[PDB]
Amino acid sequence: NLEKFVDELPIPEVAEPVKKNPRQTYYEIAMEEVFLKVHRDLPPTKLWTYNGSLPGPTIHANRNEKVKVKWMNKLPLKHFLPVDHTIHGHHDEPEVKTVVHLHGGVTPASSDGYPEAWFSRDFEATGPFFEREVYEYPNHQQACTLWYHDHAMALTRLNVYAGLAGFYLISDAFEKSLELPKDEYDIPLMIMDRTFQEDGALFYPSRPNNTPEDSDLPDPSIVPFFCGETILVNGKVWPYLEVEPRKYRFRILNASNTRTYELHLDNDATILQIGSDGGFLPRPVHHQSFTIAPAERFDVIIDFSAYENKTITLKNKAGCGQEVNPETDANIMQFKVTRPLKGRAPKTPIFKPLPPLRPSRADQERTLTLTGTQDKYGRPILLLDNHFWNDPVTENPRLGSVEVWSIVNPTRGTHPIHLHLVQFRVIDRRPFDTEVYQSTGDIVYTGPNEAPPLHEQGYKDTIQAHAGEVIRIIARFVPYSGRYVWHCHILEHEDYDMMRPMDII
Amino acid sequence: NLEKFVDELPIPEVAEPVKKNPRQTYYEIAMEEVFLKVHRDLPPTKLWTYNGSLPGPTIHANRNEKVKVKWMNKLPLKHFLPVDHTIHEGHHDEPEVKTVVHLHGGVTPASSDGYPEAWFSRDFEATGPFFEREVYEYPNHQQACTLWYHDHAMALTRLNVYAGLAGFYLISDAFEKSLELPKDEYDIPLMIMDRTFQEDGALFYPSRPNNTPEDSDLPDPSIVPFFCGETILVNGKVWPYLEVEPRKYRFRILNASNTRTYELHLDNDATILQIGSDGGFLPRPVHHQSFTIAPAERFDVIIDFSAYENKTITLKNKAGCGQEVNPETDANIMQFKVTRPLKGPKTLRIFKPLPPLRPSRADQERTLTLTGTQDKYGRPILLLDNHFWNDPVTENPRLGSVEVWSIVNPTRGTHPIHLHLVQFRVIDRRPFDTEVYQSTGDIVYTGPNEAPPLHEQGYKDTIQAHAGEVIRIIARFVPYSGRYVWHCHILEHEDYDMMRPMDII
Ligand SMILES: [Cu+2]
Ligand SMILES: [Cu+2]
Ligand SMILES: [Cu+2]
Ligand SMILES: [Cu+2]
Ligand SMILES: [Cu+2]
Ligand SMILES: [Cu+2]
Ligand SMILES: [Cu+2]
Ligand SMILES: [Cu+2]
């Protein structure tokens, strides 16, 4: 297989505004097919990317900066990965649909990137909910690390896997006061799992693993999950970073299709997390190890002072449908403390005052259940409340209303669930029978309410719902009314069809 | 039309070697179609480029550094510019879109020189008759100098180059390092190109000649005798600006235009100090108030902004294109603003020692005459010795041999000539009569021999042959043998058909 820690970790370029003034900042980002070096031991890797880079241009925004972005489609008409077509109306309809969603963004539905607000090359053909070309981002939210990715109806797994993903960092006058590592020591890390062929081209399954004969199934077929052979950080496969012996701020973002990591430093140094999806934690938390699921973001600090002239590997203890291989997916990247101290370097902590969030005075309680469904061909259809995306809206919160959502997971798998617009807070988890639900259907709890860990007590937009467990989440639906979405961020699950509309007002 | 001096002059990225060691340095450069910026007030333009950049990744090489480059074709199978099929004869199923990279001014073995008929389609699916190697080797047995790599595909060169396949290749020498010249941030490549864009931000290349009466009998599309662009780009951008410190800067000026020849001069009439030509450093630096720069000529120059702090000095042109120079447009190249503050001297010494004093008396004298005739349709074919590229070889220099070539220009045009593999030296120019020649066919000289200017006394690979004039140049054909080319580097002339093979036996 490919030799590890040979390619230098690329810092994704900051996006340059086409035009900028006090009133607003305008960007023009085009989606293109390009051929990029993933590893120096393979050939060119055809990828679909934002402005010719994987990850896409990192967009730097400030609280209440009117960031306008024209997301353009300059892709081939046909797709280079397997497109099943037995997922979604056979009145085809352009094959290559694209729409950009800013994950964790406080935006109006108009510029949120609705799955059915898609567009083909130069907007030649659009989706039913298409409205405008130039998306507006007012950024009325806390300092945090947001990421933009394709959300095209039933193509999200493929378009994201193809490389359509990038960083969107929001800075805040509060943030500047925290005396953290900045500039050269403030590095975004987009972790993705992938598989490549000998010819250096991408590989994405045409059928599920078992797949008896050609009996019943379509070709190509959607897979219930996808676990990659190799691990890429930002651009490159198992890369390295030359660091100074000092404190670094890494913005860790799991952008993988299904894979969930359990990251830890090879030296068992403490990984100090200062922030989650929504922004800074109530307090920084000493991790040692920690789990990171699709679309979760961990704003972290690691101190290399005292490991001067030493090699420290970023390791994973989380398998993917199989035991973690030490030679491959047990590794993420490698820090080498070789670069010298540019200047005198000491850096050292009170944090964000954590709002009271009283759930007793809520406006409504919802009980949402995760369930699996079968199809004609006899393969899993992952569903929310046993409801297909295309069915009538059930989740209809009022503009201003505060709701408590009880996510029940009877399934054997863990599911990271994500909600557009809002940043919710986790109340608690509670384990239930997972066996009488086989006979009856009524929930009964094995144990008492377990409050979330300190890193989950902050603002989250994507949360792990564990198996045989009910997790309660409170959210204040403010602001911007209109139609949004909530879904599971496992791409394979999201498409076909663990995704439902969410109507504010 | 376009508002000038609004876009920053970009500095083309240095190429990163795939792999490198003492024995060799290996690069993988792919040609791709991408959509760039170009100018804030025009939308993204579709371009063909090397590793997604215009210009291509500037490659930094050292004297005797084994440079191995894999030039790959990842282009569409059809071309986006006109393509006149009535120029070159078409073999079996000659694919549309042929590519081959030539390192202009490179001391390369024929195999790695990029022969016009050593072309290749996408991923080498189909090759040209003289195709041999997938990887090109560059041993770099030559002086410190400003080289550039560009497409030289048989009868497509004008289009493929216009589309943007052009990049810098810098040879550095141990006796270039001792010069104490401006280095790193203050050593800037400047690729000047003329272009025309449509309102939609797409490229425009003429489909026919300027005037056509009832489409006459002429074909569509037709190749034009010359191509003059309305807008001027430096490196990436249209009429850009450069924020400079008040000190000495080293600019490597390269005219990469189709047809257009510039007469550059600083608007403040500050001295432009040229230190080097095509082949390398001059015998002495020479002071230049204004100077003429023709396609494929390189001027290694130093400009001192020290005396002009806080001012705005524009780089101007006084050279028209089949038309009076327009002050609002093609009279301008770019704009230097001396606002950046001083990080961290007054020149250094006349320069490079070179061979003694045009000794001549070589093994062979050639008399090559430039001519123009007509075709079926009644448009100009430009030819060398009234010989088409596909006729038998007349220019066959022996491997050791030193030849003197007498280029006779009876033509009304200035036709600059380029020779592959060698770096020749100019003996002299001498104007004849032309009318005597056109009427009789005998050369008779109006005036005595005029020795070249001090900047032409060095090593050149492309030289301006003026009208009604004979120019003598001497060249030592070492150190490689095989099949090479010589031609006029006005691309439109080059393609139909002012190009001939040169055998080095
Ligand atoms: Cu997301
Ligand atoms: Cu989202
Ligand atoms: Cu799921
Ligand atoms: Cu979503
Ligand atoms: Cu050339
Ligand atoms: Cu050349
Ligand atoms: Cu010519
Ligand atoms: Cu040439």
Numbering used by the authors:
A (entry chain B): 2 to 89, 91 to 350, 353 to 509
B (entry chain A): 2 to 345, 348 to 352, 354 to 509
What's written in the study?
Here, we report the first crystal structure of the bacterial BpBOD solved at 3.5 Å resolution. The BpBOD crystal structure reveals a dimeric form. Interestingly, the BpBOD core was found to be more structured compared to the enzyme peripheral regions. As depicted, long and unstructured loops “cover” the catalytic sites, representing a large portion of the enzyme surface. Each monomer contains multi-copper T2/T3 and T1 sites having three and one copper ions, respectively. T2/T3 site residues His103, His105, His151, His153, His422, His424, His491, and His493 chelate three Cu2+ ions and exhibit high evolutionary conservation. The adjacent T1 site is comprised of residues His419, Cys492, His497, and Met502 that coordinate a single Cu2+ ion at the enzyme C’-terminal region. The revealed oxidation state of 4 Cu2+ can be correlated with the enzyme resting state. The cysteine pair Cys229 and Cys322 was found to form a disulfide bond, located 12.4 Å away from the T1 site copper ion. In total, the BpBOD sequence comprises four cysteines: one disulfide bond pair, one T1 site chelating residue (Cys492), and one oxidized Cys146 located 12 Å from the nearest T2/T3 site Cu2+ ion.
Bilirubin oxidase (BOD) is another well-studied multicopper enzyme. It contains four copper ions and allows the oxidation of bilirubin as part of the heme metabolic cycle. While many redox-active enzymes are electronically isolated from their surroundings, BOD can be activated by a direct electron transfer mechanism that occurs through its T1 site. The latter acts as an internal redox mediator and by a sequential electron transfer process activates the T2/T3 site.
